[PDB]
């Protein structure tokens, strides 16, 4: 199992499991959710300078690999290396987060980096519809609230950003109190904690970041109708459960019940999902996936989907929502059992991956909120505990007759009004 965490002057957390490489990186407890409408896309802008060609060559010669990640709740800068070169990493991490906090931001590099993410983001809004719709789902579900800020940042606030903004953010967020350095792969705990404690100092210690206003959900919808697109992508959700919630898993199990489906992959159509009977007769969609996005303040439970059957979208939604109704009144026992097995399975492949850069992002995010990583074995214990009765209570609070967030793009003329869809959140009774 493992997972060990110790303080010092800063807080360190590691997880070693003798495999191939080993990665070390600094994960900051602030991210997209800590930005503003006008400075939005600043973190995604740091991510690209840290991954700049200038800095990439410096670590490439030294035999390292750089990996950055920008999320809502957090931010991460990770360096991969061989098991032995575990010290080569820290000397680069520190070089770029202390020495080169004056370099890099030098023009000719910033302008190059900015022109590149400005295109990178313009490509995303023109092509990656599924993820764009999801981004807009957050945008409307949590509108005028922290969580509503898109990770890559807007295309406008991006071209208004100058070095100063980058610096201001770093000075306000990249701090000792709001940070966690992590190490996964095969590097031992005592090896890191000491190598870090070698070079003392603090660098803005005792400084706390500017707080804000708790994120909130709002029943709303955003429809980006584009008739020139060949499909209709849509995502829909309700207020979910935040990480470190009594129902963190109960909610995650409910999503696994309806799961994911790809109409073109033979095995997918054979799944044990009652909904798949209703959707395959007239092929209501090409694919769909259910999720249970959790964050520090709130979350989103619902599903995403793409469809070519533009004249029958109303049924896609109808059947899909009639199934969600079941979780409050008729979810069977074997539906819950199947979910557990498949939850455990997909949950395991998530934690137990052959890439430490994944493991890092998972260790950091957790210890950066609850201050400790929940062992995979401990999870299974909770998952197997969950009863049919549990799923129904959760559904009664979260799902039954509750507001919803809708977002769509492409040929969505057939997606009926908010009130029509909202109505399906329940069923008639005597």
């Amino acid at each position: 199992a493992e997972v060990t965490q110790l303080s010092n002057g800063i807080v360190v957390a590691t997880e070693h499991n003798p495999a191939h490489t080993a990665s070390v990186g600094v994960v900051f407890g602030s991210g997209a959710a800590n930005e503003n409408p006008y400075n939005n896309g600043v973190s995604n802008l740091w991510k690209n300078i840290f991954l700049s060609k200038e800095n990439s060559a410096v670590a490439a010669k030294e035999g390292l690999a750089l990996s950055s990640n920008i999320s809502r709740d957090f931010q991460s800068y990770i360096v991969s290396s061989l098991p032995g070169s575990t010290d080569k990493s820290l000397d680069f991490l520190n070089q770029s987060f202390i020495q080169q906090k004056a370099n890099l931001l030098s023009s000719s590099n910033f302008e190059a980096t900015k022109k590149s993410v400005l295109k990178q983001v313009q490509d995303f809004e023109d092509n990656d519809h599924p993820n764009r719709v999801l981004e807009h789902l957050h945008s409307t579900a949590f509108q005028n609230t922290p969580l509503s800020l898109p990770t890559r940042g807007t295309l406008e606030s991006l071209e208004n950003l100058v070095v100063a903004d980058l610096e201001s953010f770093a000075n306000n967020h990249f701090l000792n109190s709001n940070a966690v350095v992590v190490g996964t792969g095969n590097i031992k705990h005592e090896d890191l904690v000491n190598s870090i404690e070698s070079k003392n100092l603090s660098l803005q210690t005792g400084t706390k970041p500017v707080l804000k206003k708790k994120a909130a959900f709002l029943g709303s919808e955003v429809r980006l109708r584009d008739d020139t697109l060949p499909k209709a992508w849509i995502s829909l959700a309700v207020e979910g459960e935040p990480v470190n919630s009594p129902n963190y898993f109960v909610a995650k199990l409910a999503a696994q019940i309806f799961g994911s489906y790809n109409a073109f992959e033979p095995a997918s159509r054979l799944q044990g999902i009652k909904l798949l009977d209703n959707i395959q007769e007239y092929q209501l969609c090409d694919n769909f996936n259910h999720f249970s996005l959790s964050y520090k303040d709130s979350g989103l439970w619902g599903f995403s989907t793409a469809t070519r059957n533009v004249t029958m979208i109303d049924d896609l939604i109808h059947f899909t929502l009639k199934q969600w109704n079941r979780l409050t009144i008729s979810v069977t026992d074997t539906e819950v059992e199947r979910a557990k097995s498949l939850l455990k399975l997909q949950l395991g492949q998530l934690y137990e991956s052959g890439n430490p850069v994944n493991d890092a992002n998972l260790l950091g995010a957790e210890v950066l909120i609850k201050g400790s990583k929940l062992s995979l074995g401990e999870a299974f214990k909770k998952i197997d505990a969950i009863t049919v009765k549990d799923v129904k209570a959760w559904a009664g609070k979260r799902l039954w007759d509750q507001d919803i967030a809708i977002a769509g793009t492409g040929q969505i003329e057939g997606l009926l009004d908010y009130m029509r869809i909202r109505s399906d959140m329940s069923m008639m009774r005597w």
């Binding site: 044990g272 009652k274 026992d333 074997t334 059992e337």
Partner: protein, 125 residues
């Protein structure tokens, strides 16, 4: 009624030499009395097809048996609408009166039976 059911009962009879020697004759006579062979039709052409199972079957049927069946059916309608019977030599000779669609039907039936069972399988911890 299912063919899985018909084929169950039927075979049991067809196996025990007591029921066999007693029924097969009645059955052969019942069939020659039915008169369908006289319209150039095989029994399987008579199976009502307005259901998922039969529809599944007919599609799975090899091209040639299908076109043939097509002809037989049309021929039957033309003859019936003329109120005659086909010239005696064109009658389906009992040896031709084969259950050609049947295997497909039974396959489809049991396939459905399973799907049905696996949809309601209980769990025991």
């Amino acid at each position: 009624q299912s063919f899985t059911s018909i084929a169950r009962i039927g075979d049991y009879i067809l196996k025990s030499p007591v029921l066999s020697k007693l029924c097969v004759p009645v059955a052969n006579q019942f069939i020659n009395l039915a008169g369908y062979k006289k319209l150039g039709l095989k029994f399987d052409d008579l199976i009502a097809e307005e259901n998922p199972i039969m529809q599944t079957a007919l599609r799975r049927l090899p091209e040639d048996e299908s076109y043939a069946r097509a002809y037989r059916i049309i021929r039957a309608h033309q003859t019936e609408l003329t109120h005659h019977l086909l010239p005696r030599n064109e009658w389906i000779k009992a040896q031709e009166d084969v259950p050609y669609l049947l295997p497909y039907i039974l396959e489809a039936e049991a396939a459905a039976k399973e799907k049905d069972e696996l949809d309601n399988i209980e769990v025991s911890k």
